[PDB]
Design a protein around this ligand. Structure first.
Ligand SMILES: CC(=O)N[C@@H]1[C@@H](O)[C@H](O[C@@H]2O[C@H](CO)[C@H](O)[C@H](O)[C@H]2O)[C@@H](CO)O[C@H]1O
Ligand SMILES: O=c1ccn([C@@H]2O[C@H](COP(=O)(O)OP(=O)(O)O)[C@@H](O)[C@H]2O)c(=O)[nH]1
Ligand SMILES: [Mn+2]
Length: 287
């Protein structure tokens, strides 16, 4: 029964892109009415899920800070379930959770290459959606562990299929985007095509939609393997091809996933999540 104008006012942010050509909102600080949405979703009694992977020394470096910050800032006022996937449960940090948060932990196999640890998430998330997440939540987010929540990340972000604008590229022209440009890859996007450059560090939707996102990306990853090719930015290259073909029903501004190495320019008004500094010499164990 919700209507876009019930909660979204693009004229509050006149100097940034707030609407796509296919009429999806781009959610910027100032445009959303969270009170209206919190009342609407509470009456439906929703639950929201969040998947996060930590394999190898990503556990010690990032998992505690990710979960402590998610407890404080993610969908406050609604029931949330954190789904944590790790290769060694004995190293999992067991922090205290607050009202309306709970969790569960799964042991997964560690792939040999960091590139395959990142890409295999697509397979694993779909398996979990079919086995249990579809029965447990109304909406799901799937996130990288190497980042920290900084302020409220709330129900204004919910939708059928949700994409994140990558912080370094949101003002750029598509022919400058780092899409996969080799026609032999399933992830190929030709010059002359593309809407935005999306970040694979945050994506979400209903369980049905996220199942389709992850299944289609993993099919592409598998096809490339049979053709002896590996996409330039791995699962992110495939996710950008997916969202070109199947346009997202909502996009989040870079305020929702910001890199402070850029600085803090005028367009970024209140940061909800920030990147961790890269530490590849320690946390990765192959080139
Ligand atoms: C303008 C520019 O070159 N900026 C780069 C960033 O793109 C880069 O971030 C990485 O970007 C890729 C896709 O290109 C991917 O999203 C990675 O996850 C992300 O880390 C950044 C790295 O520090 O350097 C900038 O100079
Ligand atoms: O050795 C690995 C490599 C990847 N990841 C997971 O996959 C995500 C994607 O990798 P990464 O964040 O290193 O990619 P980047 O954002 O730096 O391109 C990480 O945040 C983790 O959740 C991990 O757990 N261990
Ligand atoms: Mn990351």
């Amino acid at each position: 029964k919700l209507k876009l104008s019930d909660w979204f006012n693009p004229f509050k942010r006149p100097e940034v892109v707030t609407m796509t050509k296919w009429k999806a909102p781009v959610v910027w600080e100032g445009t959303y009415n969270r009170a209206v949405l919190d009342n609407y979703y509470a009456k439906q009694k929703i639950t929201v899920g969040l998947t996060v992977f930590a394999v190898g020394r990503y556990i010690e470096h990032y998992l505690e800070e990710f979960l402590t910050s998610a407890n404080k800032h993610f969908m406050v006022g609604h029931p949330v379930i954190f789904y944590i996937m790790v290769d060694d449960v004995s190293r999992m940090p067991l922090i205290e959770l607050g009202p309306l948060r709970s969790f569960k932990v799964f042991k997964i196999k560690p792939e040999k290459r960091w590139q395959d640890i990142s890409m295999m998430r697509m397979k694993t998330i779909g398996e979990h959606i079919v086995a249990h997440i579809q029965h447990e939540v109304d909406f799901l987010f799937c996130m990288d562990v190497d980042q920290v929540f900084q302020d409220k990340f709330g129900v204004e972000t919910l939708g059928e299929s949700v994409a994140q604008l990558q912080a370094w590229w949101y003002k750029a022209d598509p022919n400058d985007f780092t899409y996969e440009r080799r026609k032999e890859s399933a992830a190929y996007i030709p010059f002359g095509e593309g809407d935005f450059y999306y970040h694979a560090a945050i994506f979400g939707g209903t369980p049905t939609q996220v199942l389709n996102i992850t299944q289609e990306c993993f099919k592409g990853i598998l096809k490339d393997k049979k053709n002896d090719i590996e996409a330039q930015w791995h699962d992110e290259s495939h996710l950008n091809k997916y969202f070109l073909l199947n346009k997202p029903t909502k996009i989040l501004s870079p305020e929702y996933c910001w890199d402070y190495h850029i600085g803090l320019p005028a367009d970024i008004k209140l940061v909800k999540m920030s990147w961790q500094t890269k530490e590849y010499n320690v946390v990765r164990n192959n080139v």
